[PDB]
Design a protein around this ligand. Sequence first.
Ligand SMILES: [Ca+2]
Ligand SMILES: [Ca+2]
Ligand SMILES: [Ca+2]
Ligand SMILES: [Ca+2]
Ligand SMILES: [K+]
Ligand SMILES: [K+]
Ligand SMILES: [K+]
Ligand SMILES: [K+]
Lengths: 75, 96, 143, 145
Amino acid sequence: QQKQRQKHFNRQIPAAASLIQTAWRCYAAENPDSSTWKIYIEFSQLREHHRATIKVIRRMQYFVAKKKFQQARKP
Amino acid sequence: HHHHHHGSDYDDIPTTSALKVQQKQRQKHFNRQIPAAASLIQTAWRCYAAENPDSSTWKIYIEFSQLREHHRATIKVIRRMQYFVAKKKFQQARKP
Amino acid sequence: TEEQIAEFKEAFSLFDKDGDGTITTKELGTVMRSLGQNPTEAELQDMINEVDADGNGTIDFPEFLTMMARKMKDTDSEEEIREAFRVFDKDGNGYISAAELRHVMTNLGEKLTDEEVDEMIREADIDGDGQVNYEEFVQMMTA
Amino acid sequence: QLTEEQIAEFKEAFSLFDKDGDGTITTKELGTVMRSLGQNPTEAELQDMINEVDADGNGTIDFPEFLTMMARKMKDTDSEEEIREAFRVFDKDGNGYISAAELRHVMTNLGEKLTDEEVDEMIREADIDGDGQVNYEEFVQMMTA
Ligand SMILES: [Ca+2]
Ligand SMILES: [Ca+2]
Ligand SMILES: [Ca+2]
Ligand SMILES: [Ca+2]
Ligand SMILES: [K+]
Ligand SMILES: [K+]
Ligand SMILES: [K+]
Ligand SMILES: [K+]
């Protein structure tokens, strides 16, 4: 009977941890930021690639707009 | 060809606006500055706003912003499914 | 509300790839696999069964809605989390050491990342010397 | 100002445009990226962007040329005045202020068009309002911090 009670409690610990974890991940998923979305590798990388290309393009568009304004003001 | 041999110092004004042609050249000159000035400010701010991972400037990319909405949605659904499974499975371990 | 409904219908379509109005285990698996995960056939069948109410092995839109409307707050979906902390509480005391929390969180069940646990302990914001008030961690999640 | 992290960053960014892995960025390559980002820029706009970067004049951007632009200063002295005098153009009143209504117009209806949400962000981040005025002289400083 002592072993039956121990193995019963032994199967409790994983269910224990999992419940807290699954409950927190639901709570964390409501925050658009937070580090819980960084666990998705390909997509987090896809965001980095997305923000990278844009920041490069926007700076290219900046210097073009900058030079075009310098030309437009030359009397 | 030939030699000038000085002038004549002869005083007289036969023959013969330009104020209309240059005033139009001045109006058109400034007219070109309006689009350029706005574009400079716009591009400069978009470089500034791009440094912020949040901000509304990333919502201008439709397909990707929707791709994020779809991404978060599927995950929210799965995580709740996993919660109820972890919920039921748990006190199935708490039922002597 | 009209927003919530349109929300859920879009979410449903994201799983029902075939547009046949039902979600199968392999459809859920495809989504989870594309999200960088590899879950067992048993894990998919467990998830489907927790939602499937008619017992036909598939999730239709009403079944989907029903899950998305299930309360995760108040009264008591709050014990199961509150006592969820029972197993790891050696001392009776409603606190657990930050070191311990990190352990059970990082090394058991769904494992979780350190950054996620970093977020956990920071957000908890309670710790006198070395103990964590998990019943104020429960209240936090179930707001 | 070159760090090991920054260097690896820029090399990744370059590869995102040079799909062909040829060590150079073409107009059609830039166009493909911009097109996949929900935009449709003219052939003139693409070659204009390349020319502002292309220093050797071969019509293509190599990695050193890319690095040089990404290292170009966007602050202080000669980039701050120019944004300022860009604001002067719309500054009808001499006084260094412009109405929020006007700003919204110029921002939303001219040049790169911009979204309302973006202009909303502008005026909110601005946090200036004497009745209805915007201190564009501190918005310049804000961007160039
Ligand atoms: Ca289906
Ligand atoms: Ca069903
Ligand atoms: Ca190339
Ligand atoms: Ca070149
Ligand atoms: K993004
Ligand atoms: K996301
Ligand atoms: K992913
Ligand atoms: K896009």
